[PDB]
Each structure stands twice: as structure tokens, then as C-alpha cells.
Amino acid sequence: GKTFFGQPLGLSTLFMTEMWERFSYYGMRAILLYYMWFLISTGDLHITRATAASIMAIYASMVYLSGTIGGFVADRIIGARPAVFWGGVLIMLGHIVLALPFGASALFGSIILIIIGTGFLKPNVSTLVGTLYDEHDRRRDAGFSIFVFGINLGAFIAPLIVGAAQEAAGYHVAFSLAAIGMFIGLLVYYFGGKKTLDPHYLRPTDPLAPEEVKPLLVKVSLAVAGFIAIIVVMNLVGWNSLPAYINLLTIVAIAIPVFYFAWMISSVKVTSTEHLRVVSYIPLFIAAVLFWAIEEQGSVVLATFAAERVDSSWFPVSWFQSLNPLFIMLYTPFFAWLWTAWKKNQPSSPTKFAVGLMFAGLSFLLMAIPGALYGTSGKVSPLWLVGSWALVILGEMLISPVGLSVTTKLAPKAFNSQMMSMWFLSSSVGSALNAQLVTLYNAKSEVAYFSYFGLGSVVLGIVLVFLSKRIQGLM
Numbered sequence: 001g002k003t004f005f006g007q008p009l010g011l012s013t014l015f016m017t018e019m020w021e022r023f024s025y026y027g028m029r030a031i032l033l034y035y036m037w038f039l040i041s042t043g044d045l046h047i048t049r050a051t052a053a054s055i056m057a058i059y060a061s062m063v064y065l066s067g068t069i070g071g072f073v074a075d076r077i078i079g080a081r082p083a084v085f086w087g088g089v090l091i092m093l094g095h096i097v098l099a100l101p102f103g104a105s106a107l108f109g110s111i112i113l114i115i116i117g118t119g120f121l122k123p124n125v126s127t128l129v130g131t132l133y134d135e136h137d138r139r140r141d142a143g144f145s146i147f148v149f150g151i152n153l154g155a156f157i158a159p160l161i162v163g164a165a166q167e168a169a170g171y172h173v174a175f176s177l178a179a180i181g182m183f184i185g186l187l188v189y190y191f192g193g194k195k196t197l198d199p200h201y202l203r204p205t206d207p208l209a210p211e212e213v214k215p216l217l218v219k220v221s222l223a224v225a226g227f228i229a230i231i232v233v234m235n236l237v238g239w240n241s242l243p244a245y246i247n248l249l250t251i252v253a254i255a256i257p258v259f260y261f262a263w264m265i266s267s268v269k270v271t272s273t274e275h276l277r278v279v280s281y282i283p284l285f286i287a288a289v290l291f292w293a294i295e296e297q298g299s300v301v302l303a304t305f306a307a308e309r310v311d312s313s314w315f316p317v318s319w320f321q322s323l324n325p326l327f328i329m330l331y332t333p334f335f336a337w338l339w340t341a342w343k344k345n346q347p348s349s350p351t352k353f354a355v356g357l358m359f360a361g362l363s364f365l366l367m368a369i370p371g372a373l374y375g376t377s378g379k380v381s382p383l384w385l386v387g388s389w390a391l392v393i394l395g396e397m398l399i400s401p402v403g404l405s406v407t408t409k410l411a412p413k414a415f416n417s418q419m420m421s422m423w424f425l426s427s428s429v430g431s432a433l434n435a436q437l438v439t440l441y442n443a444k445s446e447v448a449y450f451s452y453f454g455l456g457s458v459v460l461g462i463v464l465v466f467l468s469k470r471i472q473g474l475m
């Protein structure tokens, strides 16, 4: 019968829903940094550009960290389908706040709404995609491959459309276009989900038991009281600046995997065999952190280079952000044929982590060339950025599909659900690491910034190549 490229027609609803949410999110990311530059130039925002770059990095870090909790909220409390809807309302509200005739006072309110909203939506839309296929359906992998296609599709047209609207009608209209994009998504999701989505997912599939309610309430209350207490003593000591808070969220985002790691490597009930699998995974987790740190600097550091060091007079600078989802859509049909046809001697999944990290380092090493040859005073060809993005995404084609499968294969049965978080949390730690590194990038440190962090990523990819045989053997 009639399908959506061979899959049930319910996929088209979740295709549209996530395409328009990625449209709203990445359409905002393409102009949010430049919007902060504008507020700084008018004296309305009293921070430096290095701090504004840190905000962008720690913003993304909290979004991924929020994406590790929304799955628990839906599957236990509110339900997957209500989490996508109300998550989308919070995202729409976040963009509406920026569309209002406000300035810097609306930045923190808008950021919180999108952080909470994205955590409810992104994990539970992927969850609803799986619910379209009863088990044994081998169309599942092809359906998710089409789902991620709409993800990249929305991330591609958003910087082009939203960036052009900013040049024509200003920032407030451009931010309203992002809110409208989320509005189109909730329209197709609400009315489309009422026809093809299973009504069982209107409630939590694993609701709380009566004896589970009180301990969960105590657990979330102690974490809030402690986090509030940490903020209290900061202002008393005097560490009450915006870089001080960003450092706090940097520490709490990095301590979560560090505490989870020390919590896992120390337990006795795991015995020796599965204990080495956790130790051997540490070189893999740190490599994912370094890659996602480089990949997420495209919307921060590379966006700064595009506006200041590239002669892009005939088009909006924010259009460079479309290069990241463009190469993904171009690389996917090639790598889809590659991994299946390469039956002879396909490299191990740890090696793909190493080569993926080396290519992310080659992307930054490439960016050090124009500043060393021409200097940092003038403008260079826009082809330097399209070559940098081409390299870092080649590293993503090797790391992103293999990444989650690596953590699951090395995960002991007692750490499985927690090990899965370690993979998703590597994106939050990479952006948390960026919140400190992007401050070092400026006009006079361009060549050094790209050289040291680029070579350091290449060297650490060489080290993983050596350690690849030992880690694959444990699998």
C-alpha cells in the first residue's frame, strides 16, 4: 500500500514534527551569537564577545544534558506524546520571547524555555518513531534513517531562511520566524498524531509505583536544595559574575560523567572481566568529548571567523551554518553504500572513533593555514570554511553511527542504562569544554588556537589507533 518511502505513514508526522523543531532551534543558533554582538555594540548587553561565545557553548551543553532527562519524565510521569507537545510549546514560547521588543533581559528567560522544551521533545520524538514498528520489522533502521533526514533538512534551510529574514526585517522578525517554525511543527504533530499514533503513549508506559513517589521526590528535592545552596555561598564569597555562573554549569556538566565513571569503576558486584570494559571505554568517551567539542564550535568559533575573516559581502554570514547539515545529507547516501559493501576488512568501531577525531583535528589544522600565510588582518576565501566543515563532518560519519553501538557493546548488564547516558552526555561535556576554550579565540590568537587544539586532537586520535586493538578485543 501507500507508504512514506516504504515505512508506515505515521512516520511522515514525526518527520515533519522534528524537521520543524530543528528548523526553529538551528535557525536561532545561526543568528543568536550575532544578535548578542548587536546587543553588546549598543550597550544593552554588558558582556564581552568571549563571554557571549561562552554562553553559546554552555547553552548547547545544557540542551543535551536536558535531553538525558526528558526520556525519564515521559516514560514515567507525563507520557511520550504529551512530552512532545508541551515540549514544543516551551520551544515556541522561547522563540516568542526573543521576538518581543525586548533586549538582554529576555535572553535568560528564552534560554531556559528552550532548554526545558528541547529536553521534553527531542528524546521522545525518536521514542515515538520506534513505536511505529512492531518488533521484527526490519524497516526500522531505514525509517530512522529517513527520520534523521528530516532532522538535517530542517537544520539546512533554517540558517538560509532565518538568516535572510534577519537581513531584510531585523532580528525580532527573524526570531519570530523560528517561533512560527515550531508552530507549524505542533500543528502537524497534533492533528497528524491524532490519526496515526498509538493512543497508549498518551500516558506514561512505566508509571510510578506508590512506593516510588516519595523517594523520587526526596531525590529531586535534595539536588535542588544543594544546587541552590551552591549558588547562595557563591554570592556571599563574591563569585557572582556571569563567567562565574558559566563555570558552575561547566563543572556540574563535567562532574556528572566523572562521578558516574568513578561510581562504575569502583563497584565490586561487576567482577574483573566487565570492569576492564569500563576502563577501556574511557579512551572512547574522551574522544567523543573532543570531537563534539570541535563540531559544536562551528556555531561559535567558526561563526565568528565567518563574520570577521571571510569576504562574504554578497550573502548573510549566518548561511555558513547550513554547511554542517549540508555535508551530512551529502555524505549519508555514500556511507550507507560504503559500510554494507565493505564486507572484506571494515575497520573496528574504536578505529572509527580515532579516525573521526583526527579528521576533526584536521578541520582545525586547516583553519590555521590562512592566518599563517595571509595574516589575520584581511579576509580570506569562503572556501576555507567549506573545507573545514567538510573534514569535521567526515569525522562525524565515522563516530556518530558507531558511537552508541560501542557503548552498548562494552556496557556490563548492571551499567547498561547508565552507560547509554555516557554516550549522549559526551555532547554536553564537549560543549561544556567549549564554554572555557572559546574564550581563548580572538584575532591575535587565531593561528595558535587552531594549531594547538587541532594538533592535540590529531595526536589523541593517533593514541586511540594504538589502543584500538585492545578495546575491540574486549568486545
Ligand SMILES: CCCCCCC/C=C\CCCCCC(=O)OC[C@@H](O)CO
Pocket (backbone or CB within 6 Å): 096, 099, 100, 101, 169, 170, 171, 172, 173, 174, 176, 179, 180, 183
Ligand atoms: C502562534 C504564532 C506564534 C508566532 C508569533 C509571531 C509574532 C509576529 C510578529 C512579532 C515579531 C515581529 C515584530 C518586529 C518588531 O517588533 O521589530 C521591528 C522590526 O524592525 C525588527 O524586526
Ligand SMILES: CCCCCCC/C=C\CCCCCC(=O)OC[C@@H](O)CO
Pocket (backbone or CB within 6 Å): 073, 077, 078, 207, 208, 209, 210, 211, 213, 216, 217, 220
Ligand atoms: C514533569 C512534571 C513535574 C515533575 C517535577 C519533578 C517532581 C518529581 C516527581 C513528580 C511528582 C510525582 C507525580 C507522579 C505521581 O504522583 O504518580 C503517582 C501514581 O502514579 C502512583 O501512586
Ligand SMILES: CCCCCCC/C=C\CCCCCC(=O)OC[C@@H](O)CO
Pocket (backbone or CB within 6 Å): 366, 369
Ligand atoms: C576522504 C579523505 C579526504 C582527505 C582530503 C585531503 C585534501 C588534501 C589536500 C587539500 C589541500 C590542503 C590545504 C592546503 C590549501 O588548500 O592551500 C591552498 C591555498 O594556498 C590556495 O590559495
Ligand SMILES: CCCCCCC/C=C\CCCCCC(=O)OC[C@@H](O)CO
Pocket (backbone or CB within 6 Å): 290, 293, 294, 437, 440, 445, 448, 449, 452, 453, 454, 455, 456, 457, 460
Ligand atoms: C578543541 C577540542 C579540544 C582538543 C584539545 C586536545 C588536547 C591536547 C592539546 C591541547 C593544547 C594544549 C595547549 C593549548 C594552549 O596553549 O592554550 C592556549 C592556546 O589557545 C593558545 O592560543
